[PDB]
Structure formats: structure tokens, C-alpha cells
Design a protein around this ligand. Structure first.
Ligand SMILES: N[C@@H](CCC(=O)O)C(=O)O
Ligand SMILES: N[C@@H](CCC(=O)O)C(=O)O
Lengths: 260, 260
């Protein structure tokens, strides 16, 4: 082709297995927002591609000891993949080692509760101890709390980093399941995009509360020096300006929403 | 050691004259969100700078016949400024001729009405002729309507492009004044950021209605090949992650809002 290796992550509704995925081959085993975005970008830039789910299941963080990058970021840094098409947050530490397109989606950190939990804000979580709260490992939300100098978020970090049993989860699905099973005694910090999707799905027992804690974006990532950098950036901007990104968000979040 | 020329535009609350500006020299004549942002970026990247208000008062568009770029985009393209620090929208046609940082603000096109105007959406505007509407000349909003292939926006463009008297204004302030004087018979299409600011200012007679028409961002722009490109991008990401951009938006929009 060449057949370009695209790293991504299993995260609803971005990349999901189709019903009866075991009868399909290759790229056709998957569906979701990023599966459609990959198809659109590949058409615009004129590449053949193969979806490769990140082996360790992580977004990407650098180890304090070894300074080795894991997740999708690592797949790009170490030359295993040529492009990451996923809900991968544009951050300073990642921009130092990979390139990102302009954002294809705008978002912020948010709070997920089980319906009826007496929490409306981050300040509400920080000033109490009955309701535990946590976030995803190896991603931008955990780094946000680790680095914040805003007093409320500092207090939240000081609690989460030492909480027993652990409040951190290896996947978003694990955090959502923990909210649903914990009878109102666990809240989960996650991006507004994920939170809004889950709120639209049965059993319709969770909701997003309060405003977003920050304002940022997801971008399509390429390794430094890639000839795909500019074609990818221009493709994302063309798709944005043609309304395709809005159409795809509606397709995967709202058009078949299940919770009224 | 050089004093870097920064192009910007008079647009509230991004760049405004201080009270009694005439008794100040150079950069000290101005205040606003972008004045503060310029100071922050200059400190991070270690440059001296001089604010130069764009002589033609335009954001930037390309002439179809002469192929010449005007506005702030032109100042960068033709080597008259080294940075643009302004509410300059990241678009495909601009990305082809200049570079942009990752976004420092997220926004979309929105509708401004005189309070009481029976309009809640773009669809409402397009299906009637009793209320006129327009937008700024030489910017991204006008280009949005010109280029749209979505039915409602096509209808709106077809009306606006032939309307007489002209519904395109030279400045945002002109458009706002036209809304305020027209007894509900003129509405204005402008970015949500500028709409939200005006709604917080006396005489508190305008408001934003409906959702935004699109989702995009403002970036700090540099000419292609600039040694400032990476320093600027990293500074914006640092200011974002540190919460400084949020503090600046609150300072200039909400902290002293006048309309409840
Ligand atoms: N989008 C995040 C993952 C989710 C999260 O950290 O909440 C990242 O790129 O790391
Ligand atoms: N931010 C716009 C100007 C305002 C508008 O077009 O509404 C631009 O960069 O062109």
C-alpha cells in the first residue's frame, strides 16, 4: 500500500466491537466514532490502513522511573504505529514527544454520579468523606489532578493518591461499573464526552453533574517527522468545516439515545 | 534582543483602549484578554514585543481576483508582523498560509438578538423575512455561510449575500449597535465568545439564543517558517493546563458582569 498502522483503544462509543464481531475480519470487526473518523481521514489523505488496538489498553503516560511511554503514545514514540485515531487528549507533555492535529472534539473533565447521589460539584466532593471518588490510570485526567494548584483540586488529589482501597481504575468501563454498583458511594472523574454518552445508555442510572473543570480537545496524533502530519491536520479541519464531525457525534451519542 | 511585532485588532474584550489611553505610550494604551495573553506568552518564550493594531481593521480574507490576503492574516503572510495574538479563528484556508497554536479558546457561531425578538434558532431566522440578519465582513463567520452545504445555512447565505441595505458590517461593534437600534428587526451572527461578553454589559438589552452552529477555536498565529511556532504552541498549552486561560476569561467576561 503501504498499509498504515493506526493505534486506537477500545472505548465506547469511539471504538467498539460489532455484534458478532468474531465473524468479521480486520477493520470490519469494529464500529464507532473513531472507526468512522479513521475511514474519513483515510479517504481524504489517500491511505490504506489497519486498526491495531493498543496492546496494554492505556492512553499514554511516561513512567517516572524508566521515563518509558506506555499506551497509544508509546506506540507512536517507539515506532509501532503511524497514527493514533482515538479520544486522545492534546496535552503539553505529549506535544513534547508526538504531534497532534487541531482538535476534532472539544471537552472537559466532569463528574459522574449514580442518580440521587448528593453531589453537584467538585467542591461538594472535596468537602466530604462518605462518597469515594477516583479516575482513570495512565491518562490526562489523573495528570490534571496531580499537577493542579487550584485548592479544591489539590485537596482531591491529596485524597485520591492515598485512598484505600484504590480509587483508580484501569479502564473507563471499570470506573462506570463501580459508580453503578456502589449505591451512591463512588463518583468518577472522566471526560464530558464519555460521561454524556453513558448518560444516554440503559440502565440510565448515571448522570453528569456540575460544570466541566477544564476546556481542551482530542487530536489525531502522529510521530514526530511523519509525512502524514499536514495531510491529517488539513483533513480534520476539512471534516470540521463540512459538518462531518458534528454529524458523527450525533450519530454515536444522541440519535439513538435511550434515556429520553 | 529584538522587539517582536504583534498584530492584533480592536475587539472587546480582547483589545480595548484604556480610559484616557491618549496619555499612555505604545502597549500601555491597551487592555484586555489578548493584551494579558500577549504578556503571558512573551514572558514564557522570553521576547520583547510591540502591539501593532492591524491597519485595515480586518481579521483576514483572500481576494479571489488578486489573491492578496488582508487583515491580520495578511500582516503575517507579507512579513509585517511576527505573531497575531487576537480572537483569530483556526480555519483550513488560513492553515494553508500561516501556522496556528492549539486553541486558547473554544467557541462557535451564535445568534445575537434584541431581548424579546421571537427567534430561538437558525431555522427560525431562515423561515421568515420580517427580521433581517447579518454578520461581520472579512471573517470566518461570513465564510461559514458562503461555504455551507447545509440547507438552513444555504438559505441564510442566499438571503444575506443579496440583502440591501448590506447586512455585512465592518466591525462587530457596528453589528451590535444595529441589533440594539432596530427594535428586534435585526439579528446578528457572531461568535459565542463575543456574544457572551456583550450579554454581560449594560444596557443588557441583547442575548444569545439557541445552540452554537459549529465548534472551533482561536489560536495564536505565526508566519510559516517562524522560530516562534513551537515556543508559542507550548506556551499556550502551559497556560491552558495551569488554569490561567480560565482565569483570564473570568476576569474579562464574568467577574465584573453587569447584567445579573
Ligand atoms: N482522553 C484521556 C483519557 C481519559 C481520561 O484521562 O479521563 C487521555 O487521552 O489520556
Ligand atoms: N474570529 C473571526 C472574526 C469574527 C467573525 O467572523 O465572526 C475570524 O477570525 O475571522
Amino acid at each position: 500500500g503501504r498499509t498504515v498502522v493506526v493505534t486506537t483503544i477500545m472505548e465506547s462509543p469511539y471504538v467498539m466491537y460489532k455484534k458478532n464481531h468474531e465473524m468479521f475480519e480486520g477493520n470490519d470487526k469494529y464500529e464507532g466514532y473513531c472507526v468512522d473518523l479513521a475511514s474519513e481521514i483515510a479517504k481524504h489523505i489517500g491511505i490504506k490502513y489497519k486498526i491495531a488496538i493498543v496492546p496494554d489498553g492505556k492512553y499514554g503516560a511516561r513512567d517516572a522511573d524508566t521515563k518509558i511511554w506506555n499506551g497509544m503514545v508509546g506506540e507512536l514514540v517507539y515506532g509501532k504505529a503511524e497514527i493514533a485515531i482515538a479520544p486522545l487528549t492534546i496535552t503539553l507533555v505529549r506535544e513534547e514527544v508526538i504531534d497532534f492535529s487541531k482538535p476534532f472534539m472539544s471537552l472537559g473533565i466532569s463528574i459522574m454520579i449514580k442518580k440521587g447521589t448528593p453531589i453537584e460539584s467538585a467542591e461538594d466532593l472535596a468537602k466530604q468523606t462518605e462518597i469515594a471518588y477516583g479516575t482513570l490510570d495512565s491518562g490526562s485526567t489523573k495528570e490534571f489532578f496531580r499537577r493542579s494548584k487550584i485548592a479544591v483540586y489539590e485537596k482531591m488529589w491529596t485524597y485520591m493518591r492515598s485512598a484505600e482501597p484504590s480509587v483508580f481504575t484501569r479502564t473507563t468501563a471499570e470506573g462506570v461499573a463501580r459508580v453503578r454498583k456502589s449505591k451512591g458511594k463512588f463518583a468518577f472523574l472522566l471526560e464530558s464526552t464519555m460521561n454524556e454518552y453513558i448518560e444516554q445508555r440503559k440502565p440510565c442510572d448515571t448522570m453528569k453533574v456540575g460544570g466541566n473543570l477544564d476546556s481542551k480537545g482530542y487530536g489525531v496524533a502522529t510521530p514526530k517527522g511523519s509525512s502524514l502530519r499536514t495531510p491529517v491536520n488539513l483533513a480534520v479541519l476539512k471534516l470540521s468545516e463540512a459538518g462531518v464531525l458534528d454529524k458523527l457525534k450525533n450519530k454515536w451519542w444522541y440519535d439513538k439515545g435511550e434515556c429520553g
